[PDB]
Short mmCIF file of C-alpha atoms and ligand atoms in Angstrom, two decimals:
data_model
loop_
_atom_site.label_atom_id
_atom_site.label_comp_id
_atom_site.label_asym_id
_atom_site.label_seq_id
_atom_site.Cartn_x
_atom_site.Cartn_y
_atom_site.Cartn_z
CA UNK A 92 43.56 -21.98 -56.07
CA UNK A 93 40.58 -21.77 -58.43
CA UNK A 94 37.10 -22.18 -56.95
CA UNK A 95 38.29 -22.47 -53.37
CA UNK A 96 37.62 -20.31 -50.31
CA UNK A 97 39.54 -18.07 -47.92
CA UNK A 98 41.16 -20.08 -45.14
CA UNK A 99 40.52 -19.04 -41.55
CA UNK A 100 43.45 -16.84 -40.48
CA UNK A 101 46.41 -19.07 -39.57
CA UNK A 102 44.33 -22.25 -39.86
CA UNK A 103 47.37 -23.97 -41.40
CA UNK A 104 50.44 -22.70 -39.46
CA UNK A 105 52.77 -24.98 -41.44
CA UNK A 106 51.90 -23.14 -44.68
CA UNK A 107 54.82 -21.23 -46.21
CA UNK A 108 55.11 -18.56 -48.88
CA UNK A 109 58.31 -18.49 -50.97
CA UNK A 110 58.97 -14.98 -52.26
CA UNK A 111 61.34 -12.92 -54.38
CA UNK A 112 61.65 -9.13 -54.64
CA UNK A 113 58.35 -9.05 -56.52
CA UNK A 114 56.55 -11.26 -54.04
CA UNK A 115 55.00 -14.72 -53.75
CA UNK A 116 55.94 -17.28 -56.43
CA UNK A 117 55.54 -20.67 -54.73
CA UNK A 118 54.24 -22.38 -51.62
CA UNK A 119 56.11 -24.57 -49.15
CA UNK A 120 55.63 -26.55 -45.93
CA UNK A 121 57.47 -26.14 -42.63
CA UNK A 122 58.64 -29.66 -41.68
CA UNK A 123 61.07 -28.67 -38.90
CA UNK A 124 62.06 -25.32 -37.35
CA UNK A 125 64.92 -24.92 -39.84
CA UNK A 126 63.61 -26.89 -42.84
CA UNK A 127 60.85 -26.28 -45.39
CA UNK A 128 59.67 -28.66 -48.10
CA UNK A 129 58.59 -27.47 -51.55
CA UNK A 130 58.54 -28.51 -55.21
CA UNK A 131 61.91 -28.77 -56.94
CA UNK A 132 60.38 -26.91 -59.89
CA UNK A 133 60.05 -23.84 -57.67
CA UNK A 134 63.81 -23.39 -57.28
CA UNK A 135 64.91 -24.85 -60.62
CA UNK A 136 65.37 -21.48 -62.34
CA UNK A 137 65.60 -19.04 -59.44
CA UNK A 138 68.42 -17.41 -57.48
CA UNK A 139 68.13 -19.39 -54.24
CA UNK A 140 70.14 -16.71 -52.44
CA UNK A 141 67.36 -14.23 -53.20
CA UNK A 142 64.50 -16.43 -52.02
CA UNK A 143 62.73 -15.33 -48.85
CA UNK A 144 60.93 -17.98 -46.81
CA UNK A 145 57.89 -16.36 -45.20
CA UNK A 146 56.26 -18.17 -42.28
CA UNK A 147 53.12 -17.21 -40.36
CA UNK A 148 51.46 -15.32 -43.21
CA UNK A 149 47.77 -15.08 -44.16
CA UNK A 150 47.10 -11.95 -46.19
CA UNK A 151 50.13 -11.28 -48.37
CA UNK A 152 48.87 -7.80 -49.31
CA UNK A 153 49.17 -6.53 -45.74
CA UNK A 154 52.03 -6.11 -43.30
CA UNK A 155 51.70 -8.91 -40.75
CA UNK A 156 53.64 -8.95 -37.44
CA UNK A 157 52.92 -12.68 -37.16
CA UNK A 158 55.37 -13.29 -40.01
CA UNK A 159 58.85 -14.77 -39.65
CA UNK A 160 61.19 -14.47 -42.63
CA UNK A 161 64.23 -16.61 -43.38
CA UNK A 162 66.75 -17.09 -46.16
CA UNK A 163 67.73 -20.39 -47.78
CA UNK A 164 71.06 -21.74 -46.54
CA UNK A 165 71.20 -25.11 -48.29
CA UNK A 166 69.20 -27.12 -50.83
CA UNK A 167 68.61 -30.89 -50.75
CA UNK A 168 67.47 -32.47 -54.01
CA UNK A 169 66.06 -35.91 -54.78
CA UNK A 170 66.43 -36.46 -58.53
CA UNK A 171 63.96 -33.91 -59.92
CA UNK A 172 63.12 -34.68 -63.57
CA UNK A 173 61.92 -31.44 -65.28
CA UNK A 174 60.87 -33.16 -68.51
CA UNK A 175 58.85 -36.03 -67.04
CA UNK A 176 57.78 -33.98 -64.00
CA UNK A 177 59.01 -36.62 -61.53
CA UNK A 178 60.47 -36.37 -58.02
CA UNK A 179 59.21 -32.79 -57.78
CA UNK A 180 60.40 -32.25 -54.22
CA UNK A 181 63.14 -30.26 -52.54
CA UNK A 182 64.11 -29.45 -48.97
CA UNK A 183 65.36 -25.96 -48.18
CA UNK A 184 67.44 -25.51 -45.03
CA UNK A 185 66.90 -22.09 -43.48
CA UNK A 186 69.58 -19.64 -42.28
CA UNK A 187 68.04 -19.93 -38.83
CA UNK A 188 65.30 -21.71 -36.90
CA UNK A 189 61.68 -20.63 -36.73
CA UNK A 190 60.03 -19.75 -33.44
CA UNK A 191 57.25 -22.33 -33.12
CA UNK A 192 54.01 -20.73 -31.93
CA UNK A 193 50.31 -20.39 -32.72
CA UNK A 194 50.99 -19.00 -36.19
CA UNK A 195 54.05 -21.06 -37.11
CA UNK A 196 54.09 -24.84 -36.73
CA UNK A 197 55.73 -28.01 -38.01
CA UNK A 198 53.54 -30.23 -40.19
CA UNK A 199 52.95 -33.96 -39.65
CA UNK A 200 54.10 -36.32 -42.40
CA UNK A 201 52.78 -39.77 -43.39
CA UNK A 202 54.51 -43.12 -42.95
CA UNK A 203 57.04 -44.06 -45.64
CA UNK A 204 55.31 -45.73 -48.59
CA UNK A 205 51.75 -44.99 -47.45
CA UNK A 206 49.41 -44.71 -50.43
CA UNK A 207 46.04 -42.98 -50.57
CA UNK A 208 43.07 -44.86 -51.96
CA UNK A 209 40.65 -43.51 -54.52
CA UNK A 210 38.11 -41.36 -52.70
CA UNK A 211 40.31 -39.95 -49.96
CA UNK A 212 39.26 -36.42 -48.99
CA UNK A 213 42.02 -33.81 -48.80
CA UNK A 214 42.45 -30.08 -48.56
CA UNK A 215 44.56 -28.24 -51.14
CA UNK A 216 45.76 -24.69 -50.43
CA UNK A 217 47.88 -21.83 -51.69
CA UNK A 218 48.18 -18.20 -52.74
CA UNK A 219 48.19 -19.12 -56.44
CA UNK A 220 45.99 -17.75 -59.23
CA UNK A 221 42.31 -17.44 -58.36
CA UNK A 222 41.09 -18.48 -61.78
CA UNK A 223 41.94 -19.67 -65.25
CA UNK A 224 42.28 -15.86 -65.45
CA UNK A 225 42.26 -14.10 -62.04
CA UNK A 226 45.73 -13.46 -60.59
CA UNK A 227 47.47 -14.25 -57.29
CA UNK A 228 45.42 -14.34 -54.09
CA UNK A 229 46.07 -12.00 -51.18
CA UNK A 230 44.43 -14.20 -48.54
CA UNK A 231 45.43 -17.87 -48.31
CA UNK A 232 42.92 -20.10 -50.12
CA UNK A 233 41.86 -23.66 -49.36
CA UNK A 234 39.95 -26.21 -51.41
CA UNK A 235 38.28 -29.57 -50.82
CA UNK A 236 39.60 -32.13 -53.31
CA UNK A 237 39.26 -35.89 -53.76
CA UNK A 238 42.07 -38.35 -54.46
CA UNK A 239 41.80 -40.15 -57.79
CA UNK A 240 44.01 -42.90 -59.18
CA UNK A 241 42.63 -42.77 -62.73
CA UNK A 242 44.36 -40.51 -65.25
CA UNK A 243 47.27 -40.41 -62.78
CA UNK A 244 50.55 -42.29 -62.59
CA UNK A 245 51.76 -44.28 -59.58
CA UNK A 246 54.52 -41.69 -59.14
CA UNK A 247 51.98 -38.98 -58.27
CA UNK A 248 49.10 -38.39 -55.89
CA UNK A 249 46.36 -36.77 -57.96
CA UNK A 250 43.15 -35.05 -56.96
CA UNK A 251 39.97 -33.94 -58.66
CA UNK A 252 36.93 -31.84 -57.77
CA UNK A 253 33.73 -33.24 -59.31
CA UNK A 254 30.61 -31.37 -60.35
CA UNK A 255 32.43 -28.11 -61.03
CA UNK A 256 35.72 -26.66 -62.26
CA UNK A 257 38.22 -26.04 -59.46
CA UNK A 258 41.79 -26.92 -58.56
CA UNK A 259 45.31 -25.63 -57.98
CA UNK A 260 46.88 -23.12 -60.35
CA UNK A 261 50.03 -21.12 -61.08
CA UNK A 262 51.64 -19.96 -57.87
CA UNK A 263 50.35 -22.97 -55.95
CA UNK A 264 53.31 -25.17 -56.90
CA UNK A 265 55.11 -26.39 -53.80
CA UNK A 266 52.06 -25.99 -51.57
CA UNK A 267 50.97 -28.81 -49.25
CA UNK A 268 48.07 -31.18 -49.82
CA UNK A 269 46.69 -32.21 -46.43
CA UNK A 270 44.94 -35.58 -46.17
CA UNK A 271 43.81 -37.14 -42.91
CA UNK A 272 45.87 -34.53 -41.06
CA UNK A 273 49.13 -35.38 -42.83
CA UNK A 274 51.00 -33.71 -45.70
CA UNK A 275 50.58 -36.29 -48.47
CA UNK A 276 51.37 -34.08 -51.43
CA UNK A 277 53.23 -31.10 -52.83
CA UNK A 278 51.43 -29.30 -55.68
CA UNK A 279 53.35 -30.12 -58.85
CA UNK A 280 51.45 -29.69 -62.11
CA UNK A 281 48.12 -29.38 -63.89
CA UNK A 282 46.98 -30.54 -67.34
CA UNK A 283 44.59 -28.84 -69.75
CA UNK A 284 45.06 -25.59 -67.89
CA UNK A 285 43.93 -24.82 -64.35
CA UNK A 286 40.63 -26.29 -63.15
CA UNK A 287 39.89 -28.02 -66.46
CA UNK A 288 37.35 -30.28 -64.81
CA UNK A 289 38.92 -33.11 -66.79
CA UNK A 290 42.52 -33.70 -65.75
CA UNK A 291 43.23 -34.28 -62.06
CA UNK A 292 45.83 -32.08 -60.37
CA UNK A 293 49.16 -33.80 -59.75
CA UNK A 294 51.18 -33.63 -56.52
CA UNK A 295 54.56 -35.06 -55.50
CA UNK A 296 53.82 -38.17 -53.36
CA UNK A 297 55.32 -37.11 -50.03
CA UNK A 298 54.90 -40.57 -48.48
CA UNK A 299 57.37 -42.01 -51.00
CA UNK A 300 60.06 -39.60 -49.80
CA UNK A 301 59.66 -39.91 -46.02
CA UNK A 302 62.86 -41.87 -45.29
CA UNK A 303 64.77 -39.30 -47.36
CA UNK A 304 63.11 -36.39 -45.54
CA UNK A 305 63.81 -37.93 -42.13
CA UNK A 306 67.49 -38.48 -42.96
CA UNK A 307 67.81 -34.73 -43.49
CA UNK A 308 65.68 -33.19 -40.73
CA UNK A 309 66.68 -35.89 -38.21
C1 LIG B 625 36.15 -30.38 -46.72
O1 LIG B 625 37.40 -30.46 -46.02
C2 LIG B 625 37.28 -30.23 -44.60
C3 LIG B 625 38.67 -30.37 -44.02
O2 LIG B 625 39.24 -31.63 -44.44
C4 LIG B 625 39.68 -32.43 -43.38
O3 LIG B 625 40.77 -31.83 -42.68
C5 LIG B 625 41.92 -31.58 -43.52
C6 LIG B 625 42.92 -30.81 -42.69
C7 LIG B 625 42.47 -32.90 -44.06
O4 LIG B 625 42.94 -33.69 -42.98
C8 LIG B 625 41.37 -33.67 -44.80
O5 LIG B 625 41.84 -34.97 -45.14
C9 LIG B 625 40.11 -33.80 -43.92
O6 LIG B 625 39.05 -34.36 -44.69
C10 LIG B 625 36.32 -31.24 -43.95
O7 LIG B 625 36.11 -30.84 -42.58
C11 LIG B 625 35.78 -31.85 -41.67
O8 LIG B 625 34.38 -32.11 -41.66
C12 LIG B 625 33.95 -33.13 -40.73
C13 LIG B 625 32.46 -33.32 -40.94
O9 LIG B 625 32.16 -33.60 -42.30
C14 LIG B 625 34.30 -32.70 -39.31
O10 LIG B 625 33.90 -33.70 -38.38
C15 LIG B 625 35.81 -32.47 -39.22
O11 LIG B 625 36.15 -32.00 -37.92
C16 LIG B 625 36.27 -31.44 -40.27
N1 LIG B 625 37.72 -31.37 -40.26
C17 LIG B 625 38.35 -30.20 -40.18
C18 LIG B 625 39.84 -30.25 -39.89
O12 LIG B 625 37.79 -29.11 -40.32
C19 LIG B 625 34.98 -31.29 -44.70
O13 LIG B 625 34.21 -32.38 -44.22
C20 LIG B 625 35.21 -31.47 -46.20
N2 LIG B 625 33.94 -31.40 -46.91
C21 LIG B 625 33.70 -32.20 -47.94
C22 LIG B 625 32.29 -32.20 -48.50
O14 LIG B 625 34.56 -32.93 -48.44
#
């Protein structure tokens, strides 16, 4: 997240960090005790059996007892198109079920097909790069963004910060976009580099995949 701010500790208990030996590489959202939702791009070229799903985290640089770590048991895809950057969503079934508490919670999803109008206010978040040249964040970052339909296709939910350069960046892919209390997007891709101030950030439109999601998590 470029130009954002540190989130209050555990302000978003549904926020997930996907990690590999080296550490954080993508975000995710807890949508049920044993299911997380992320971007298909995140697991396209990675050894799923090596991925660690970290719940209840805030500062990735410190050892946190509030954390709960799981492995990926199964993957559910929905037609991800790596060339056109479409259907960038995947559901990862965990090797166990999370203990729901103050630091680990299930997110609320929108109604199937619900679209967001131009002007909707959302909150983007993630442990991605802090700048168009700053590196991965230690403390979870959040950012106020506005939904825009221009310079965006109907197959995406896009957002833009006006009056300054800010937005999601590398490492934020798969992270949730919260709008009106519901997870309406999954960070997918940027254009013109991070926080260009020109191209809106693109997210997978969660609302379009609700019936699919529900068929899997019950
Ligand atoms: C910046 O964003 C915060 C948080 O956004 C809201 O909550 C998110 C979880 C998501 O649901 C978004 O769609 C929401 O817009 C805004 O904080 C709210 O501020 C109002 C007063 O302006 C207050 O009454 C609410 O309780 C706050 N909500 C929360 C959860 O903190 C804030 O207004 C935004 N600022 C700007 C200038 O956009």
